[PDB]
Design a protein around this ligand. Structure first.
Ligand SMILES: CCCCCCCCCCCCC/C=C/[C@@H](O)[C@H](N)CO
Ligand SMILES: *C(=O)CCCCCCCCCCCCC
Ligand SMILES: *C(=O)CCCCCCCCCCCCC
Lengths: 62, 279, 266, 4, 60, 266, 62, 4
């Protein structure tokens, strides 16, 4: 049940993919730590919530 | 792979494509990049937004309560041999303001408890190490009337027994909301006055409050019987949201909080003075 | 070539049509068009009523006048429509109700008038009260119906601690709720800037932390219209022009039928 | 185990 | 019904989802969920109060 | 074997259920179950509202008492339901409305009581007036709502030719309209004969010379309940037992929405 | 001897079957924790303990 | 190990 993932390495020693290991010890998922491997999204629903979305090179009002 | 987009090289323009002009009346933000209005070079971008994900913005224990509880001889007056705290993030301001960038949220909650004690009197002997009971009393369960009545038997409510000097206690709680998300803002009432009501008190309720007891209370006591010298303790509670999702962003609080609603009262002047043409 | 423009629109719902020849495109809040509760998101088990064209049609509220000293107007939904035809009847006969809305705000002037209105649609628009007592605005005062309310330039605390008014005191640059008005642009919005357009159209999905709720107890959306730039004309000091708000329920469904709710407003 |  | 076999009757039992005036007359009660029970050889009648709620769970 | 009987029925419509353990089967008038207007029989072109469970449910009218001197009762449809919940609201907000009905008449007594009620459903039940003036019953008097009207044993002509009552004078053996009561059996009907059954159930299709009409101006069906054999019990001379009428709209559709009709009844 | 099972996840992070691991360390089964993976049953032995169980649409007394 |  060990999950092995890659670390995003910042400073490098003068010594490659370094991995880390996680095992969940509890049945309830609320006990789990955060994996912090989080995806993102498009801001459009806030920055461009327009019915006809127009291209930035074209006039906004036609 | 999580880096932000690369800057593209772009050169001069003389054309009918005009990205610099727009109409903000439409409700949209103009998605320009520097290469739309200046000549840019190519830059391989390596920066990322790893630390501003919703999980990383909330991934800190924030203090939400300081509960004081004493261990001394039970006298006949009002004492603090046990204390009760109604669970909330609105007794402090810092975590409240970060959660209120959003209207709704869904998360699990980690509570860590830091306990400190001290003597109050110069000397009436000493005290042996104290054990603390933190009992969760959900809405509806009986609340203690004295520090050792039957409710502390805790057969169904969860309790933590913490030993002084041990590492801070810590537990996690699931998403326990009655709805599909927690509401940080509720524009409404729990009751409606009807025309046929006998009097006006019947349908009156507080604006923007939902249930009365919300999440219940934490009841804290020192389990030890009293020593001859009095010992005062404080339990500081730190909340950390984990496995966080949030919906509908809001302007952040700009003037001091005045209670659990959105009311304001003083210091309604957040901006300072600066000349229109002063750098 | 044949001539379609994002400035000219026709909206038809039920037996009502709106035309505008000076729009600035239209906003669909949070990119979500309204929809009915899906079976896998359903919670009350009784069969819902869906009045469809009888309630999902445009209702025009009473016109308000924009003058040089106007500070702004606000309405809450579904409250502003509580007395509108069969939408109000279905709202009061049922414990639960759900609805999205098309909001169309109308304000024409001329090529020599100037001014800009900000039209913001805010989920859970909690407003601040008028006194030292917290969360004390009463149900009848929090819910003005189609009349809506107004903003003020400053906090005037109700002092008759004897017969408190229990009203909101929405200060305009604080958006009536303790945040700065300039950041209200994170909410779905349009601007009616008189040199550019004469209307704003915003489509609102149902937003709540529940699939359906009590429409009588809870308002889902607030509409706030504030003069971002004040009205002005020629060199006259008392120009006034109308602002008319027309709103249509969309995808209305109701659950929990029984006798009618009759709130006490007066 | 499961590497990701 | 624990009357004798010779007794007859019809009874309306109703459920009004919240938010309006609590029924004081049959006229108001019959606008909500209801069953009209006819007394007879099947001695008993069941009315089901359907889950009709805004929240996904109510408080006890 | 497991036990189904044409004496025991359950009717469920919307959020309402009726049970009876002493029925005498049920009548579907003219063999036609109610239905919506088909496209090839359609006439108004606007999209109809079909409130479905909000209006097609059982409404119970006020109980009337059957005593030894009762001559009979009559109601008209849709009039008896004009003030019933959202059926009445849809009826008055729309120019046109169409509906079929399930009528359930309830009257229990005991094995020692006797009497027989004739329950008749009559299309276009025109009733006769009280005076020398022809066709003079007024709108408010022709339409009693859920209260219904009564029959008489004889023609009592209104004589106050000054302030005429303008009421119907329905004589019972003439079915209130100049024909003999004994031939009313050509209309869809059941009999509640107390030794046999305690209820009558009749399903009524919409019947009219048009696919849809004004419900406010025109009643499609009349319900007439007359004692074919008078109530009697033990040897008592003043026995009374209740008669309760419960009616449910079926396949309701409405066209021509506008502001609400408010008839003048008083 | 590690047992790996799935957690029933409640709140989800913006990151699937999350598993947890268990090993019993003692010989006596009384030492074990509770697995809480508990099956349920039919209430009929209490709600309908009738010799001839009849269907709800049919009359109870025939 | 034994996944279940
Ligand atoms: C032994 C100690 C157990 C402690 C158990 C605590 C249970 C309650 C956890 C509540 C987390 C609350 C977060 C806030 C939610 C609110 O925003 C909203 N009012 C809900 O609609
Ligand atoms: C997946 O889990 C495969 C096996 C991993 C073996 C190492 C286990 C370390 C101990 C976990 C104990 C959890 C609490 C009983
Ligand atoms: C199944 O158990 C396969 C092997 C699991 C390896 C991890 C063991 C961790 C230590 C268990 C010690 C128990 C007490 C001696």
């Amino acid at each position: 049940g060990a999950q092995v993932s890659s670390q995003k390495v910042g400073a490098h020693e003068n010594s490659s993919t370094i991995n880390y290991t996680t095992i969940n010890y509890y049945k309830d998922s609320a006990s789990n730590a955060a994996s912090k491997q989080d995806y993102s999204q498009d801001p459009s629903k806030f920055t461009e919530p327009l019915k006809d979305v127009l291209i930035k090179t074209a006039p906004a009002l036609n | 792979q999580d880096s932000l987009p690369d800057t593209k090289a772009s050169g001069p323009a003389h054309s009918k494509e005009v990205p610099a002009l727009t109409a903000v009346e439409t409700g949209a933000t103009n998605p320009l990049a520097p290469s739309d209005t200046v000549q840019t070079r190519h830059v391989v971008q390596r920066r990322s937004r790893s630390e501003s994900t919703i999980e990383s913005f909330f991934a800190r224990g924030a203090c939400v309560a300081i509960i004081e509880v004493d261990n001394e001889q039970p006298t006949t007056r009002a004492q603090k041999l046990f204390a009760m705290w109604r669970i909330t993030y609105k007794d402090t301001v810092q975590l409240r303001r970060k959660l209120e960038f959003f209207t709704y949220s869904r998360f699990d909650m980690e509570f860590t408890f830091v306990v400190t004690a001290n003597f109050t009197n110069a000397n009436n002997g000493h005290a042996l190490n104290q054990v603390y009971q933190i009992m969760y009393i959900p809405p509806g369960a009986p609340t203690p009337k004295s520090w050792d009545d039957y409710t502390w038997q805790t057969s169904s409510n969860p309790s933590i027994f913490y030993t002084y000097g041990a590492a801070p206690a810590r537990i996690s709680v699931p998403y326990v909301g009655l709805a599909n998300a927690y509401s940080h803002f509720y524009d409404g009432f729990a009751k409606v006055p009807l025309k046929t009501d006998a009097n006006d008190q019947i349908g009156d309720s507080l604006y923007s409050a939902m249930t009365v007891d919300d999440f219940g209370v934490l009841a804290v006591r020192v389990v030890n019987d009293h020593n001859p010298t009095k010992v005062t303790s404080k339990v500081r509670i730190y909340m950390k949201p984990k496995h966080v999702r949030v919906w509908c962003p809001r302007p952040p609080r700009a003037v001091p909080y005045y209670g659990p609603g959105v009311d304001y009262r003083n210091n309604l002047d957040p901006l300072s003075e600066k000349g229109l043409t002063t750098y | 070539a044949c001539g379609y423009s994002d400035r000219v629109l026709q909206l038809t719902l039920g037996n009502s049509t709106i035309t505008t020849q000076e729009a600035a495109n239209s906003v669909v809040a949070y990119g979500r068009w309204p929809e009915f509760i899906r079976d896998d998101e359903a919670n009350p088990v009784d069969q819902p009523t869906e009045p469809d064209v009888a309630t999902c049609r445009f209702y025009t509220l009473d016109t308000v006048m924009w003058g040089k000293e106007s500070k702004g107007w606000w309405w809450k939904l579904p409250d502003a429509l509580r007395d509108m035809g069969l939408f109000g009847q279905n709202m009061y006969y049922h414990y639960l109700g759900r609805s999205g809305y098309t909001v169309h705000v109308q304000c024409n002037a001329s090529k020599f008038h100037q001014g800009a209105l900000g039209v913001f649609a805010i989920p859970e628009y909690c407003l601040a009260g008028d006194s030292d007592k917290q969360r004390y605005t009463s149900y009848a005062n929090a819910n003005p119906g189609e009349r809506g309310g107004k903003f003020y330039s400053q906090f005037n605390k109700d002092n008759a601690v004897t017969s408190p008014k229990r009203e909101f005191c929405p200060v305009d640059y604080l958006l009536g709720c303790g945040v700065l008005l300039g950041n209200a642009f994170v909410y779905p919005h349009q601007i009616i800037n008189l040199r550019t357009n004469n209307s704003a159209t915003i489509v609102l999905p149902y937003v709540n932390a529940l699939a359906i709720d009590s429409m009588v107890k809870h308002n889902n959306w607030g509409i706030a219209i504030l003069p971002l730039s004040p009205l002005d004309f020629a060199q006259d000091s008392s120009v006034e022009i109308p602002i008319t708000v027309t709103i249509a329920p969309m995808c209305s469904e109701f659950n929990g039928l029984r006798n009618v709710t009759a709130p006490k407003f007066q | 185990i499961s590497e990701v | 019904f624990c009357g004798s076999m010779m007794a007859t009757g019809k009874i309306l039992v109703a459920y009004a989802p919240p938010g309006a005036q609590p029924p004081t007359s049959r006229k108001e009660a019959m606008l909500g969920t209801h069953v009209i029970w006819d007394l007879g050889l099947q001695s008993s009648c069941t009315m089901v109060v359907p889950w009709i709620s805004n929240v996904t769970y109510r408080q006890t």
